[PDB]
């Protein structure tokens, strides 16, 4: 059996949120843990849940893999009805990207000894930004295969090459000692319904009308701002010569940019006035 690029790793949304939160908690250093699940098949590895590691006072080493801790936690999880077997481990590289150091590499063999199909995950809490999550999974390339000059895996599928690797990883031994694992996300429909429910504003919030005096004062101030932007813009349109430099205008324009502020201010003024409109009067009808 040759390890194949068509292998895919599934990490639960709960697992993702757990790694992200736990990494943020210990962003100053590196926090490690284990993923709980099973090996779906020779190509498919699914991950459900993780539990964090109480870390020894060494911020550059993962040499404190306490085994009494794992045994206790596994037994109690079994009592939960979750006998899932550890599928892999994750650790964080805040701002250091996804890659395997000598210490991580050493731990990786140490666990590969137990199970050849262990999955190591790297989560960047910092660069993992609103809309894009920075995480990657890696497993080691047998040094004997490398010394033989052979390709460590057989690729019947092109999925493994979809994500362009990080030049840091190329500096940190990618494809020489180890390789990346393509990541997708298994998402349950109920999880999606509840997730959509999260951002749903209170249906009353539309009812909370702004105080008329304050709203009117904002209108007044924004109108005076439109006056100032208008006069600035009149000068800007008039002073504009036949040879108007677009680059210079981008670098420095009238009042930052009279047109843009005019547009934004009219938009916000309209929105505020007309939402206040809707609020007051749908109250009038129904109350």
């Amino acid at each position: 059996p040759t390890l194949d690029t068509s292998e895919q790793v599934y990490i639960s949304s709960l697992a993702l949120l757990k790694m992200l939160k736990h990494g943020r908690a210990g962003v100053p250093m590196e926090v490690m843990g284990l993923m709980l699940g099973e090996f779906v098949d020779e190509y498919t590895v699914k991950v459900v849940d993780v539990f964090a590691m109480p870390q020894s006072g060494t911020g550059v080493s993962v040499e404190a893999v306490d085994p009494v801790f794992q045994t206790n936690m596994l037994d109690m999880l079994k009592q939960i009805g979750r006998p899932e077997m550890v599928v892999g481990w994750y650790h964080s590289h805040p701002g250091f990207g996804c890659w395997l150091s000598g210490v991580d590499i050493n731990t990786q063999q140490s666990f590969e000894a137990l199970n050849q199909r262990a999955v190591a995950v790297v989560v960047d809490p910092i660069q993992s930004v609103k809309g894009k999550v920075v995480m990657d999974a890696f497993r080691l390339i047998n040094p004997q295969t490398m010394m033989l000059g052979q390709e460590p895996r057989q690729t019947t599928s092109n999925l493994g090459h979809l994500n362009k690797p990080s030049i840091q990883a190329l500096i940190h031994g990618l494809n020489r000692h180890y390789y990346s694992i393509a990541i997708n996300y298994r998402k349950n429909e109920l999880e999606e319904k509840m997730l959509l429910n999260l951002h749903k504003k209170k249906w009353n919030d539309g009812l909370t009308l702004k105080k008329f005096d304050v709203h009117s004062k904002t209108n007044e101030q924004t109108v005076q701002e439109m006056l100032g932007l208008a006069i600035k813009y009149n000068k800007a349109v008039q002073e504009e010569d036949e040879l108007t430099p677009e680059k210079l205008v981008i670098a420095k324009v009238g009042r930052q940019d009279a047109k843009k502020h005019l547009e934004e201010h009219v938009s916000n003024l309209m929105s505020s006035n007309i939402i206040q409109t809707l609020g007051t009067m749908l109250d009038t009808v129904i109350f």
Partner: protein, 192 residues
Amino acid sequence: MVLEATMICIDNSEWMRNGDYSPNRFQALSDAVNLICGAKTQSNPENTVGILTMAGKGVRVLVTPTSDLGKILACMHGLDIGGEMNLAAGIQVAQLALKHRQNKKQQQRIIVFAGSPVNYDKKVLEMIGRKLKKNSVALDVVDFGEDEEGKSEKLEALVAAVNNNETSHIVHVPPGGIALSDVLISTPIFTG
């Protein structure tokens, strides 16, 4: 070893305050309960041991099943003894407390300590035992104290109503200087 969920149905009626048993019946029962908790925990760390009081203003569940022997000891030390045991309501709340389960795979075992006379009709005990039979709850009855005529027959009838493949036993502890724990050790309660 089998995973078991045991709730020690402790009586708090008067008939444990007698000094005839050991030095004190209540103290002897406390020692017996502590030893039972220790033995059950030693059998498996996952075993669950619960506590319930039959007598008083009403049947109260002090410590639903738990393995923290500290909590069990603390609640035994803070017991206010008293009242007339409600064996029917006591067993009903004992079922309530043995359905206090984290691991659904464990078995249900009731340990009943009877120190006072049972003023309950045979029929009510039989229906309660049949409900337990439907719920597949093992019942162990510890009859201790002076054997008034009729209590033993009622307890045996309840055990028969609950007996299911020899999973329910009745233990009669004669009055004497022999500690309750020593007698309970030799009973099938500990051997399983």
